[PDB]
PDB file of C-alpha atoms and ligand atoms in Angstrom:
ATOM      1  CA  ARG A   1       8.623  17.976 -10.944  1.00  0.00           C
ATOM      2  CA  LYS A   2       5.108  16.438 -11.443  1.00  0.00           C
ATOM      3  CA  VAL A   3       6.392  13.364 -13.443  1.00  0.00           C
ATOM      4  CA  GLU A   4       8.984  12.703 -10.624  1.00  0.00           C
ATOM      5  CA  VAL A   5       6.036  12.484  -8.115  1.00  0.00           C
ATOM      6  CA  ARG A   6       3.868  10.675 -10.782  1.00  0.00           C
ATOM      7  CA  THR A   7       6.652   8.103 -11.581  1.00  0.00           C
ATOM      8  CA  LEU A   8       7.222   7.739  -7.781  1.00  0.00           C
ATOM      9  CA  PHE A   9       3.448   7.013  -7.265  1.00  0.00           C
ATOM     10  CA  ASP A  10       3.421   4.927 -10.532  1.00  0.00           C
ATOM     11  CA  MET A  11       6.538   2.976  -9.325  1.00  0.00           C
ATOM     12  CA  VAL A  12       4.597   2.289  -6.042  1.00  0.00           C
ATOM     13  CA  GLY A  13       1.318   1.686  -7.988  1.00  0.00           C
ATOM     14  CA  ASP A  14      -1.879   0.682  -6.079  1.00  0.00           C
ATOM     15  CA  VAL A  15      -1.361   0.627  -2.233  1.00  0.00           C
ATOM     16  CA  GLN A  16      -5.001  -0.297  -1.240  1.00  0.00           C
ATOM     17  CA  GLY A  17      -4.587  -3.001   1.486  1.00  0.00           C
ATOM     18  CA  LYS A  18      -0.733  -2.974   1.110  1.00  0.00           C
ATOM     19  CA  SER A  19       1.635  -2.559   4.139  1.00  0.00           C
ATOM     20  CA  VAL A  20       4.230   0.237   3.437  1.00  0.00           C
ATOM     21  CA  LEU A  21       7.629   0.832   5.164  1.00  0.00           C
ATOM     22  CA  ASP A  22       8.907   4.404   4.422  1.00  0.00           C
ATOM     23  CA  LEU A  23      12.748   4.507   4.933  1.00  0.00           C
ATOM     24  CA  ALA A  24      14.502   7.917   5.322  1.00  0.00           C
ATOM     25  CA  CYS A  25      10.871   9.085   5.960  1.00  0.00           C
ATOM     26  CA  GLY A  26      11.837  12.527   7.411  1.00  0.00           C
ATOM     27  CA  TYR A  27       8.629  13.927   9.047  1.00  0.00           C
ATOM     28  CA  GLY A  28       6.755  11.165   7.114  1.00  0.00           C
ATOM     29  CA  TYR A  29       5.463  13.164   4.066  1.00  0.00           C
ATOM     30  CA  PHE A  30       5.510  10.189   1.611  1.00  0.00           C
ATOM     31  CA  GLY A  31       4.272   7.391   3.964  1.00  0.00           C
ATOM     32  CA  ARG A  32       1.456   9.775   5.085  1.00  0.00           C
ATOM     33  CA  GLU A  33       0.361  10.362   1.415  1.00  0.00           C
ATOM     34  CA  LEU A  34       0.290   6.522   0.903  1.00  0.00           C
ATOM     35  CA  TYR A  35      -1.777   6.257   4.174  1.00  0.00           C
ATOM     36  CA  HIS A  36      -4.452   8.464   2.439  1.00  0.00           C
ATOM     37  CA  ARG A  37      -4.391   6.212  -0.725  1.00  0.00           C
ATOM     38  CA  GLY A  38      -5.557   3.267   1.457  1.00  0.00           C
ATOM     39  CA  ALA A  39      -2.361   1.522   2.732  1.00  0.00           C
ATOM     40  CA  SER A  40      -3.348  -1.254   5.252  1.00  0.00           C
ATOM     41  CA  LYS A  41      -0.367  -0.089   7.399  1.00  0.00           C
ATOM     42  CA  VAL A  42       2.431   2.559   7.159  1.00  0.00           C
ATOM     43  CA  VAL A  43       5.668   2.465   9.261  1.00  0.00           C
ATOM     44  CA  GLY A  44       8.309   5.258   9.031  1.00  0.00           C
ATOM     45  CA  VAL A  45      12.073   4.877   9.773  1.00  0.00           C
ATOM     46  CA  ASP A  46      14.692   7.711   9.918  1.00  0.00           C
ATOM     47  CA  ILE A  47      18.204   7.876  11.549  1.00  0.00           C
ATOM     48  CA  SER A  48      17.460  11.487  12.807  1.00  0.00           C
ATOM     49  CA  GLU A  49      15.902  11.869  16.331  1.00  0.00           C
ATOM     50  CA  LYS A  50      14.814  15.395  15.167  1.00  0.00           C
ATOM     51  CA  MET A  51      12.966  14.083  12.032  1.00  0.00           C
ATOM     52  CA  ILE A  52      11.111  11.246  13.920  1.00  0.00           C
ATOM     53  CA  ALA A  53      10.129  13.713  16.741  1.00  0.00           C
ATOM     54  CA  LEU A  54       8.633  16.064  14.048  1.00  0.00           C
ATOM     55  CA  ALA A  55       7.058  12.980  12.304  1.00  0.00           C
ATOM     56  CA  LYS A  56       5.199  11.920  15.540  1.00  0.00           C
ATOM     57  CA  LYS A  57       4.211  15.623  16.063  1.00  0.00           C
ATOM     58  CA  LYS A  58       2.799  15.760  12.457  1.00  0.00           C
ATOM     59  CA  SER A  59       0.912  12.407  12.989  1.00  0.00           C
ATOM     60  CA  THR A  60      -0.719  14.054  16.095  1.00  0.00           C
ATOM     61  CA  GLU A  61      -1.802  17.098  13.945  1.00  0.00           C
ATOM     62  CA  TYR A  62      -3.248  14.682  11.264  1.00  0.00           C
ATOM     63  CA  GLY A  63      -4.614  12.159  13.858  1.00  0.00           C
ATOM     64  CA  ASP A  64      -3.159   9.371  11.617  1.00  0.00           C
ATOM     65  CA  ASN A  65      -2.161   5.802  12.666  1.00  0.00           C
ATOM     66  CA  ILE A  66       1.487   5.940  11.373  1.00  0.00           C
ATOM     67  CA  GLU A  67       4.198   4.232  13.540  1.00  0.00           C
ATOM     68  CA  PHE A  68       7.682   5.915  13.567  1.00  0.00           C
ATOM     69  CA  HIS A  69      11.072   4.429  14.682  1.00  0.00           C
ATOM     70  CA  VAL A  70      14.572   6.012  15.056  1.00  0.00           C
ATOM     71  CA  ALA A  71      16.888   3.535  13.213  1.00  0.00           C
ATOM     72  CA  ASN A  72      19.838   3.255  10.771  1.00  0.00           C
ATOM     73  CA  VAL A  73      18.483   1.238   7.749  1.00  0.00           C
ATOM     74  CA  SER A  74      21.819  -0.786   7.637  1.00  0.00           C
ATOM     75  CA  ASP A  75      21.054  -2.479  11.045  1.00  0.00           C
ATOM     76  CA  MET A  76      17.267  -1.828  11.613  1.00  0.00           C
ATOM     77  CA  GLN A  77      15.133  -4.740  13.019  1.00  0.00           C
ATOM     78  CA  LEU A  78      11.303  -4.175  12.955  1.00  0.00           C
ATOM     79  CA  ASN A  79      10.587  -7.986  13.210  1.00  0.00           C
ATOM     80  CA  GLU A  80       8.043  -7.537  10.333  1.00  0.00           C
ATOM     81  CA  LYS A  81       7.902  -7.849   6.481  1.00  0.00           C
ATOM     82  CA  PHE A  82       6.052  -5.369   4.153  1.00  0.00           C
ATOM     83  CA  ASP A  83       4.482  -5.425   0.630  1.00  0.00           C
ATOM     84  CA  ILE A  84       6.209  -2.118  -0.376  1.00  0.00           C
ATOM     85  CA  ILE A  85       9.385  -0.404   0.951  1.00  0.00           C
ATOM     86  CA  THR A  86       9.970   3.215  -0.201  1.00  0.00           C
ATOM     87  CA  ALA A  87      13.591   4.532   0.033  1.00  0.00           C
ATOM     88  CA  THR A  88      13.626   8.012  -1.644  1.00  0.00           C
ATOM     89  CA  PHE A  89      17.130   9.670  -1.352  1.00  0.00           C
ATOM     90  CA  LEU A  90      18.391   7.089   1.228  1.00  0.00           C
ATOM     91  CA  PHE A  91      21.087   5.244  -0.779  1.00  0.00           C
ATOM     92  CA  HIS A  92      23.311   8.304  -1.598  1.00  0.00           C
ATOM     93  CA  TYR A  93      23.941   8.565   2.220  1.00  0.00           C
ATOM     94  CA  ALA A  94      25.696   5.112   1.954  1.00  0.00           C
ATOM     95  CA  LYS A  95      29.390   6.116   2.505  1.00  0.00           C
ATOM     96  CA  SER A  96      30.782   2.713   1.275  1.00  0.00           C
ATOM     97  CA  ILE A  97      29.922  -0.278  -1.010  1.00  0.00           C
ATOM     98  CA  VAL A  98      29.649  -2.346   2.267  1.00  0.00           C
ATOM     99  CA  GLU A  99      27.107   0.182   3.697  1.00  0.00           C
ATOM    100  CA  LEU A 100      25.141   0.278   0.368  1.00  0.00           C
ATOM    101  CA  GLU A 101      25.041  -3.596   0.437  1.00  0.00           C
ATOM    102  CA  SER A 102      24.022  -3.533   4.179  1.00  0.00           C
ATOM    103  CA  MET A 103      21.072  -1.186   3.310  1.00  0.00           C
ATOM    104  CA  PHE A 104      19.821  -3.383   0.362  1.00  0.00           C
ATOM    105  CA  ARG A 105      20.202  -6.580   2.518  1.00  0.00           C
ATOM    106  CA  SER A 106      18.179  -4.893   5.347  1.00  0.00           C
ATOM    107  CA  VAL A 107      15.435  -3.875   2.787  1.00  0.00           C
ATOM    108  CA  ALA A 108      15.289  -7.481   1.387  1.00  0.00           C
ATOM    109  CA  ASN A 109      14.992  -8.906   4.984  1.00  0.00           C
ATOM    110  CA  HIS A 110      11.906  -6.604   5.560  1.00  0.00           C
ATOM    111  CA  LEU A 111      10.139  -7.495   2.225  1.00  0.00           C
ATOM    112  CA  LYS A 112       7.319 -10.092   1.885  1.00  0.00           C
ATOM    113  CA  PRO A 113       7.747 -12.641  -0.956  1.00  0.00           C
ATOM    114  CA  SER A 114       7.075 -10.762  -4.289  1.00  0.00           C
ATOM    115  CA  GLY A 115       7.368  -7.457  -2.303  1.00  0.00           C
ATOM    116  CA  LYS A 116       9.017  -4.442  -4.032  1.00  0.00           C
ATOM    117  CA  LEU A 117      11.537  -1.687  -3.172  1.00  0.00           C
ATOM    118  CA  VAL A 118      10.786   1.758  -4.732  1.00  0.00           C
ATOM    119  CA  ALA A 119      13.837   4.116  -4.550  1.00  0.00           C
ATOM    120  CA  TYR A 120      14.890   7.526  -6.010  1.00  0.00           C
ATOM    121  CA  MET A 121      18.556   8.724  -6.045  1.00  0.00           C
ATOM    122  CA  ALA A 122      21.079  10.963  -7.890  1.00  0.00           C
ATOM    123  CA  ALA A 123      21.567   9.429 -11.413  1.00  0.00           C
ATOM    124  CA  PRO A 124      24.304   6.723 -11.144  1.00  0.00           C
ATOM    125  CA  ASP A 125      25.593   7.725 -14.667  1.00  0.00           C
ATOM    126  CA  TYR A 126      26.215  11.485 -14.048  1.00  0.00           C
ATOM    127  CA  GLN A 127      29.888  12.610 -14.403  1.00  0.00           C
ATOM    128  CA  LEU A 128      30.798  16.357 -13.971  1.00  0.00           C
ATOM    129  CA  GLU A 129      32.855  16.327 -17.262  1.00  0.00           C
ATOM    130  CA  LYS A 130      29.591  15.628 -19.248  1.00  0.00           C
ATOM    131  CA  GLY A 131      28.189  19.015 -18.006  1.00  0.00           C
ATOM    132  CA  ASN A 132      27.032  20.926 -14.856  1.00  0.00           C
ATOM    133  CA  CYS A 133      23.264  21.154 -13.968  1.00  0.00           C
ATOM    134  CA  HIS A 134      22.879  24.949 -13.246  1.00  0.00           C
ATOM    135  CA  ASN A 135      19.687  24.951 -15.444  1.00  0.00           C
ATOM    136  CA  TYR A 136      18.168  22.162 -13.210  1.00  0.00           C
ATOM    137  CA  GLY A 137      18.893  24.288 -10.053  1.00  0.00           C
ATOM    138  CA  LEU A 138      21.701  21.996  -8.713  1.00  0.00           C
ATOM    139  CA  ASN A 139      25.333  23.335  -8.694  1.00  0.00           C
ATOM    140  CA  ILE A 140      28.053  20.568  -8.522  1.00  0.00           C
ATOM    141  CA  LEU A 141      30.897  22.258  -6.518  1.00  0.00           C
ATOM    142  CA  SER A 142      33.332  19.259  -6.173  1.00  0.00           C
ATOM    143  CA  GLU A 143      33.824  15.686  -7.537  1.00  0.00           C
ATOM    144  CA  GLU A 144      35.941  13.107  -5.587  1.00  0.00           C
ATOM    145  CA  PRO A 145      36.330   9.728  -7.380  1.00  0.00           C
ATOM    146  CA  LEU A 146      35.505   6.471  -5.461  1.00  0.00           C
ATOM    147  CA  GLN A 147      36.043   2.812  -6.503  1.00  0.00           C
ATOM    148  CA  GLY A 148      32.643   2.326  -8.270  1.00  0.00           C
ATOM    149  CA  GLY A 149      31.206   5.878  -7.902  1.00  0.00           C
ATOM    150  CA  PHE A 150      31.877   9.556  -6.942  1.00  0.00           C
ATOM    151  CA  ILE A 151      31.440  11.857  -3.889  1.00  0.00           C
ATOM    152  CA  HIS A 152      29.646  15.055  -5.110  1.00  0.00           C
ATOM    153  CA  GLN A 153      29.227  18.260  -3.041  1.00  0.00           C
ATOM    154  CA  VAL A 154      26.042  19.880  -4.506  1.00  0.00           C
ATOM    155  CA  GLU A 155      24.764  23.460  -3.924  1.00  0.00           C
ATOM    156  CA  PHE A 156      20.954  23.820  -4.390  1.00  0.00           C
ATOM    157  CA  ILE A 157      20.276  27.315  -5.923  1.00  0.00           C
ATOM    158  CA  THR A 158      17.933  28.388  -3.035  1.00  0.00           C
ATOM    159  CA  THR A 159      17.822  31.440  -0.658  1.00  0.00           C
ATOM    160  CA  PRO A 160      19.600  30.715   1.551  1.00  0.00           C
ATOM    161  CA  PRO A 161      21.689  28.259  -0.541  1.00  0.00           C
ATOM    162  CA  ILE A 162      22.397  24.817   1.100  1.00  0.00           C
ATOM    163  CA  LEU A 163      25.275  22.348   0.371  1.00  0.00           C
ATOM    164  CA  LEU A 164      24.589  18.534   0.342  1.00  0.00           C
ATOM    165  CA  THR A 165      27.112  15.636  -0.091  1.00  0.00           C
ATOM    166  CA  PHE A 166      25.939  12.735  -2.374  1.00  0.00           C
ATOM    167  CA  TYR A 167      27.705   9.334  -2.601  1.00  0.00           C
ATOM    168  CA  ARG A 168      26.821   8.698  -6.304  1.00  0.00           C
ATOM    169  CA  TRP A 169      27.289   4.897  -6.800  1.00  0.00           C
ATOM    170  CA  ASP A 170      27.344   3.673 -10.472  1.00  0.00           C
ATOM    171  CA  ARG A 171      24.877   1.124 -12.008  1.00  0.00           C
ATOM    172  CA  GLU A 172      27.305  -1.862 -11.534  1.00  0.00           C
ATOM    173  CA  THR A 173      27.742  -1.118  -7.748  1.00  0.00           C
ATOM    174  CA  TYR A 174      23.885  -0.968  -7.402  1.00  0.00           C
ATOM    175  CA  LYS A 175      23.375  -4.175  -9.510  1.00  0.00           C
ATOM    176  CA  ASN A 176      25.898  -6.096  -7.283  1.00  0.00           C
ATOM    177  CA  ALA A 177      24.237  -4.667  -4.080  1.00  0.00           C
ATOM    178  CA  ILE A 178      20.730  -5.704  -5.356  1.00  0.00           C
ATOM    179  CA  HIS A 179      22.089  -9.181  -6.407  1.00  0.00           C
ATOM    180  CA  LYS A 180      23.811  -9.906  -3.004  1.00  0.00           C
ATOM    181  CA  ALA A 181      20.581  -8.821  -1.158  1.00  0.00           C
ATOM    182  CA  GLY A 182      18.677 -11.629  -3.020  1.00  0.00           C
ATOM    183  CA  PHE A 183      16.257  -9.573  -5.205  1.00  0.00           C
ATOM    184  CA  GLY A 184      14.775 -11.562  -8.160  1.00  0.00           C
ATOM    185  CA  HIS A 185      14.845  -8.667 -10.708  1.00  0.00           C
ATOM    186  CA  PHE A 186      14.993  -4.817 -10.843  1.00  0.00           C
ATOM    187  CA  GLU A 187      14.888  -1.899 -13.339  1.00  0.00           C
ATOM    188  CA  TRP A 188      15.997   1.771 -13.622  1.00  0.00           C
ATOM    189  CA  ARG A 189      13.019   4.191 -14.034  1.00  0.00           C
ATOM    190  CA  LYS A 190      13.883   7.387 -16.022  1.00  0.00           C
ATOM    191  CA  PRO A 191      10.783   9.232 -17.342  1.00  0.00           C
ATOM    192  CA  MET A 192      10.973  11.542 -20.425  1.00  0.00           C
ATOM    193  CA  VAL A 193       8.692  14.670 -20.469  1.00  0.00           C
ATOM    194  CA  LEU A 194       7.529  16.156 -23.840  1.00  0.00           C
ATOM    195  CA  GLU A 195       7.521  20.020 -24.125  1.00  0.00           C
ATOM    196  CA  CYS A 196      20.935  15.851 -14.352  1.00  0.00           C
ATOM    197  CA  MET A 197      17.430  14.543 -13.343  1.00  0.00           C
ATOM    198  CA  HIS A 198      17.253  11.906 -10.511  1.00  0.00           C
ATOM    199  CA  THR A 199      16.533   8.198 -11.342  1.00  0.00           C
ATOM    200  CA  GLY A 200      13.915   5.758  -9.982  1.00  0.00           C
ATOM    201  CA  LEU A 201      14.875   2.188  -8.933  1.00  0.00           C
ATOM    202  CA  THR A 202      12.301  -0.648  -8.511  1.00  0.00           C
ATOM    203  CA  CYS A 203      13.535  -4.041  -7.134  1.00  0.00           C
ATOM    204  CA  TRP A 204      11.313  -7.176  -6.742  1.00  0.00           C
ATOM    205  CA  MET A 205      11.978 -10.124  -4.345  1.00  0.00           C
ATOM    206  CA  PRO A 206      11.309 -13.705  -5.575  1.00  0.00           C
TER     207      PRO A 206
HETATM  208  N1  LIG B 301      21.230   5.343   7.284  1.00  0.00           N
HETATM  209  C1  LIG B 301      20.074   5.995   7.352  1.00  0.00           C
HETATM  210  N2  LIG B 301      18.991   5.346   7.841  1.00  0.00           N
HETATM  211  C2  LIG B 301      17.828   6.013   7.912  1.00  0.00           C
HETATM  212  N3  LIG B 301      17.549   7.261   7.548  1.00  0.00           N
HETATM  213  C3  LIG B 301      18.640   7.878   7.063  1.00  0.00           C
HETATM  214  C4  LIG B 301      19.903   7.332   6.937  1.00  0.00           C
HETATM  215  N4  LIG B 301      20.779   8.264   6.401  1.00  0.00           N
HETATM  216  C5  LIG B 301      20.048   9.334   6.215  1.00  0.00           C
HETATM  217  N5  LIG B 301      18.741   9.170   6.604  1.00  0.00           N
HETATM  218  C6  LIG B 301      17.670  10.153   6.514  1.00  0.00           C
HETATM  219  O1  LIG B 301      17.343  10.309   5.160  1.00  0.00           O
HETATM  220  C7  LIG B 301      16.564  11.516   5.038  1.00  0.00           C
HETATM  221  C8  LIG B 301      16.808  12.116   3.676  1.00  0.00           C
HETATM  222  S1  LIG B 301      15.777  13.562   3.341  1.00  0.00           S
HETATM  223  C9  LIG B 301      14.097  12.893   3.331  1.00  0.00           C
HETATM  224  C10 LIG B 301      13.860  11.951   2.170  1.00  0.00           C
HETATM  225  C11 LIG B 301      12.400  11.511   2.020  1.00  0.00           C
HETATM  226  N6  LIG B 301      12.293  10.016   1.895  1.00  0.00           N
HETATM  227  C12 LIG B 301      11.798  12.182   0.778  1.00  0.00           C
HETATM  228  O2  LIG B 301      11.741  11.594  -0.301  1.00  0.00           O
HETATM  229  O3  LIG B 301      11.359  13.335   0.819  1.00  0.00           O
HETATM  230  C13 LIG B 301      16.966  12.394   6.229  1.00  0.00           C
HETATM  231  O4  LIG B 301      15.825  12.656   7.038  1.00  0.00           O
HETATM  232  C14 LIG B 301      18.023  11.563   6.972  1.00  0.00           C
HETATM  233  O5  LIG B 301      17.925  11.674   8.374  1.00  0.00           O
END
């Protein structure tokens, strides 16, 4: 998925001298890559004690300067604003519209004026009835309808196979969440390769 990574790095653009906050950072893969492209500062946040422990361990192996915090994005307080916030596969862990809105509000509160959010999530549009994504390597096992989205149980065709639950919020739910948070504008980023897929989201503060 080169164009996914390309779009992701295109969505972020130039990071030279930019402060980056990596939300749902895991062991800090993405923030670390932006550290090597000349980010002035990188901070990582994840809700998992396990992931942040492994992140700090990896930073030791790399001898990098990256700061890691255990926090829920919905109520995190770093007492600092950043040029760029990355939130790849964070928002489909939001179990409610209120939680989704909490997360966007928290992102906005940590953005410098004219700062941008770069996100990637399960396509808001996707409905099971349209067709399953076996070809893409993602098996949709169950669909539970929510007010303004769906709960999807997804099996990734791996060995062993693993089952993930996505809260797939529709475009309108996202638009309202982005609006309430006080973003100036945003757009959906959906690349098309020549010779089911996840969607990018870029949001700019005034
Ligand atoms: N409310 C929340 N706040 C912060 N991190 C969260 C969260 N809910 C889930 N996460 C974290 O989100 C991560 C998703 S997997 C890692 C995603 C990573 N940004 C990437 O693109 O590769 C998990 O590590 C999980 O612990």
